[PDB]
Amino acid sequence: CTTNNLQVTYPAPVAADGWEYRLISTGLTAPRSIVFDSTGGLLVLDAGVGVRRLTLQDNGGTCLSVTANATLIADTALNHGLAISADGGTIYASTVNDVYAYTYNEQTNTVDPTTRRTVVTNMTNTDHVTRTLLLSSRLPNELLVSRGSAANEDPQARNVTSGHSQIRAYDISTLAATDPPFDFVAGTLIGWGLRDSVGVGENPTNGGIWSVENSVDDLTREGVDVHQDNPGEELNFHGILGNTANQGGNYGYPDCYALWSTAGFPDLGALEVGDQFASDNATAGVTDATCNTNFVDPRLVFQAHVSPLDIKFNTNGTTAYITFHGSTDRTTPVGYSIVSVAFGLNGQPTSPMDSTTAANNILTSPDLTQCPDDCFTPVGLTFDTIGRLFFSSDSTGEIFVLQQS
Ligand SMILES: *[C@@H]1O[C@H](CO)[C@@H](O)[C@H](O)[C@H]1NC(C)=O
Ligand SMILES: *[C@@H]1O[C@H](CO)[C@@H](O)[C@H](O)[C@H]1NC(C)=O
Ligand SMILES: [Ca+2]
Ligand SMILES: [Ca+2]
């Protein structure tokens, strides 16, 4: 079954009925985004090291072993994002300021450092420093890049030209060898008002673009501290690449936040779960009505502070898997899990926007009071060619495989 028998060092994750998993790699520095190359190797963005390639021996199901590891790219500035071209010959990886493209030699499984070129630049800011990369499947030359806020409440997120808290799309086919990288704000605007939407994914049913949001910390409502269960994390819809419908809007940060818990909420009015409301620190003139009329509400909301970091859809588009990295801004911890959300034939969640039960648990921490110290912190997801799910846990240095049994 496996060459080595890696065991977790904390109360082990609990698999929902029908699911099984196995720990397949340990001792990584800080694994973030992951993706398979064309030769069946697993590329890992190990933050603070670079891009590592894990050689896997596959005996079927969860019976996988790492037999070797190689550092393809050594660059301590790479901190999260990673993508590979459809043809398998170009690796993309980002620092806080730039998105780099490297030529990957699939024959030798090596990257010549001198082939590196910058494709997007000027992304640097403090606080939220990850630059998530997604290459479209439907439009394989379209690269999306996510960029969060410079503070918990960043005023410059009100200025679209600042580049803060937004998702941009770049046609990489239009980029000559001679010409320089795009400026971050030169890309197509997928959305702004997105505090730190680290997770971005493409639904194969119709090509819909989806993002998951890490919402504001230490929320007050009419001065009252309501942060324990507000605001909700969010699933945001950005329409479809190569069209403008439902795309480019302002998702509300930092003037509007989405409602998770209605109990004890000051001035609830006619607000429902999922509706956005004005922040106590909203710019002068913004009210709850402004949030309803001028800003884009989330398609779904999730328990406050779960901190989602990735969203990946299955081949069918019937299910999206999301990593909940775990709370730091709540008294009892929440998250520390992998959940699924069901999607219908029109490419939308089957749950309504006021659902509090749309996230279905797949892998959960047995005892949330032990998190984060004794729990996994899921970050990146990726599917192999046969539908098995692989995910990283950055805090624990692990890679796991997950499948139905
Ligand atoms: C990056 O930003 C600087 C300062 O605004 C700008 O002058 C420079 O041209 C930008 N780089 C690119 C390639 O746009
Ligand atoms: C609003 O700003 C105040 C003062 O900076 C802060 O204490 C409070 O947490 C903020 N409320 C939010 C983020 O909802
Ligand atoms: Ca948060
Ligand atoms: Ca929002």
Author numbering: 26 to 430
Pull verbatim passages from the article behind this deposition:
The three-dimensional structure of TrAA12 reveals important similarities with bacterial soluble glucose dehydrogenases (sGDH). Based on these results, the AA12 family of enzymes is likely to have a catalytic mechanism close to that of bacterial sGDH.
Soaking experiments were performed on native crystals in crystallization buffer supplemented with calcium, PQQ, and l-fucose. A large additional electron density inside a pocket and a reorganization of the amino acids surrounding this electron density were observed in each of the eight structures. A third water molecule completes this well-organized network. This organization is conserved in the native crystal, where the calcium ion is replaced by a water molecule. Asp354 presents the largest difference, with a displacement of 1.55 Å of its C-α and a change of the orientation of its side chain. These movements partially close a part of the binding site and bring the side chains of Asp242 and Thr353 near the putative substrate binding site.
